[model samples]
Target: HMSFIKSQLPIFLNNCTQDSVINYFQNSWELENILMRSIIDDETFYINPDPLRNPLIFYLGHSAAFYINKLIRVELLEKGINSDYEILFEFGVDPENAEELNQAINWPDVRQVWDYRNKAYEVILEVIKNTTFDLPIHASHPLWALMMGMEHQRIHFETSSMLLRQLPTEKVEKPQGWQYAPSQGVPNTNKMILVEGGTVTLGKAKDNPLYGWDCEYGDRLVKVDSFFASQYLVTNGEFLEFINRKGYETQSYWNEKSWQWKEENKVKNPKFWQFNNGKYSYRAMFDEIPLPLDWPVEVNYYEAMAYCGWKGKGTRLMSEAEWNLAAYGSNYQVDIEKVNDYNLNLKFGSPSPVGLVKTAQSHSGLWDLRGNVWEWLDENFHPLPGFEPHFLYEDNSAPFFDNNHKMMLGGAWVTQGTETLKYYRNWFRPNFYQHAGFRIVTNH
Candidate 1:
């Protein structure tokens, strides 16, 4: 199948020959470069819009450094581009507090950082084309790290985009080719629909013909019980009902930690929403748009849980197994060349109204399984049984196993590469904001 947009989409393991890998590296980097150029200019690049995230300069260089450091492990590179840049941009942080989040770092000038990036990019492309390996490149293959690094960079594409949204609207410019969803539709009334359940396994197998994260390569099975799931993702109109009923003022709806969070932040509505006069407006990536009542309501785990409590008895977020069952184990089961036709991929550039893609419905009538926005799940993030950490990236999934991070299923519009495939794992702390929303489930 061909990619839906100008951006070069993911190259699966089965399709990753020497030539395609080289092409993919070039394509992926070009997309990242264009994204950086469109959103922030040289002066704006140094601005740290989100206190919890690194500035645009770090992300611009992070993907390039990832290729260098990861390739060195497999002997593709004898050394790095620059020792300082390689280490400084190697990884971003997930700190425990604002004090730790906003530290003064002496960063290199903008021009010097891109110079380092160019040198590394050329070296990475050279290695991919020059390396000799067999057709079926498995986990044990020496070139596996090349594939690993590609998927890692693809994941950051969405994460970095989220940070860019925190910047002032004027500072962020829409890319030349990008387009937001063209129209809006009022949402259908949500109903509790029966979702037939069966055995659903949680992880990818060793023989899977796709690249995966360390947390994705093991098995955990659950005999999912029959449950009733909401027909659509909770819409802004539905969430507004909670707000109008003084949801935030009701202490009984929130847990102790979430109550403390609300008390400190004094958040009355979703972070992206602004109350203007008596109406609500949504702050998109590059502009302010009237709130689309039918669009899914993006919120964090704390707010989602509070909403579930507000909905009263038996309402809850889906378990990981329940989510996969509803997804029919993977989005690949949808049987279409363009998964973007139904699921919201980079094609939309922003979320469409729920149920807008009518042809995308499940045989059982569920909507938006792998797109629009990532749907938050009930479980805390942990390794699948028989989980083993990658030697090169040991801390990838282990540190987040602390139970503080909540797992999110499905992917947002910005997610790409192997991340768009099934069996992918993504998480964030309880209060973290994302282009993420939720659906509810109850015992049948």
Candidate 2:
């Protein structure tokens, strides 16, 4: 296995028997294995090739995705060049599946996986042969295909890893520790802050001339008026207050649409939150423990809006423009290195405690806007104006834009490294907790 993986790197070194080539090949092998092991937690996953067929495959698939970086390294070696690590990673795997890997695959599915990987290889080889390090090639084409392949491979790996955990024979290998940065300044109180609208530029910066999803590139002027937004997410403690105040018992707190959802579900409080022994305790990522009060309450749009109504304070869902500014704004700068300190080291499981590990960017005084958790916004899942979809034979962004769903932001702990960019968007229905959470946007 090691030899086969190493062979992929030799092409990058001009087939030379140079020391650089040998080192590149060796590094790629080690990296790939480390990644594979990260996903493949159990003993059985090591030997199972069809791990994606069931939950047991989660270990194998998760471990395999860690190799995404290695695969890109091999491609770079073929060109005798190196670029930003994020640039390489953005190519080798899919970023969309931050939580679950859609479904299982069969034998024919396995073959298709091989075929797509083969296609990616062809594109990489062709690009490496023609382009020099000093002069890079037009990246859109190569990365589109590469990201698709990576996304596909990663989904299977994550799904397989999940399956690995369910098998009776499998030994559980949870992420090592509660590694997270120490608490920074205290979380701001939950209240609305209004910003006056002006003509400001939005989208990834020009210096970021690397591969970007079609939606993320190009700066456009956005003009809008100020609105109020909650200073922080509605916390478990706050929601408990709402419920105790008869928030759920009164129809006055809900709109017609929200009322229907409330009754249909016997909605009471945020999902996963419960009162036990006359005290509040709930599930941690992998273990049942006391509930964290400061994290935003996990609820769908209906409940979120209802909370606003219950307060008898005017509450509204935030526009995409508003949410985007909060996450990437200069007020909150992310210290990338500090991420490994708190909560993040756990690897795979469920969401972490609220505010346990937060990002503090000095350039921008914003706190925990990006990775601590995913925030649900009030906007529908729609393509930006003048946006064109990338149709990879598989209907990706287009098919998911049906009504009754909202946009999700910021990568979560469950989100894999390759998929966790601050700007990337994940959308789901307002009701599902499957990779969903919320932040506040007040009317100005």
Predicted structure with the largest TM-score when compared to the true one: 1
Q: Which segments of model 1 are wrong by more than 4 Å?
A: 1-5, 103-105, 329-338
lDDT tens digits by residue: candidate 2, 42-128: 444434332223233233223233234334543532431223322322322222222333331221233333333344444444543
Compared with the true structure, model 2 gives a TM-score of 0.61
> What lDDT would candidate 2 get against the real structure?
0.47
User: Model 2 segments beyond 4 Å from truth?
Assistant: 1-139, 151-173, 178-188, 204-208, 214-220, 329-366, 391-394, 416-418
The global C-alpha lDDT for each of the candidates, from Candidate 1 onward, is: 0.80, 0.47
The alpha-carbon deviation from the true structure for residue 276 of candidate 2, after best TM-score superposition, in angstroms, is 2.7
Query: Cα-based RMSD of the predictions, in order?
Result: 2.4, 9.7
Residue 278 CA displacement from its true place in model 1, Å = 2.3
lDDT of 1 by residue, 1-444 (tens): 113445555665666788878877776777777677766568888887767677788888898898898888888789988988888998888875566877644778888888887898888877876788567887878788888888777777788788788888888788776767644656788888888868887788887877788998888778988889988899988898999999999988998999988888889999888999889988877888888888889999999989999998868999888888887742333222455555544757777788877765666677887788998998999889989988878888998999888999788777777777677898988788888999988895
**Each prediction's TM-score versus the true structure:** 0.95, 0.61
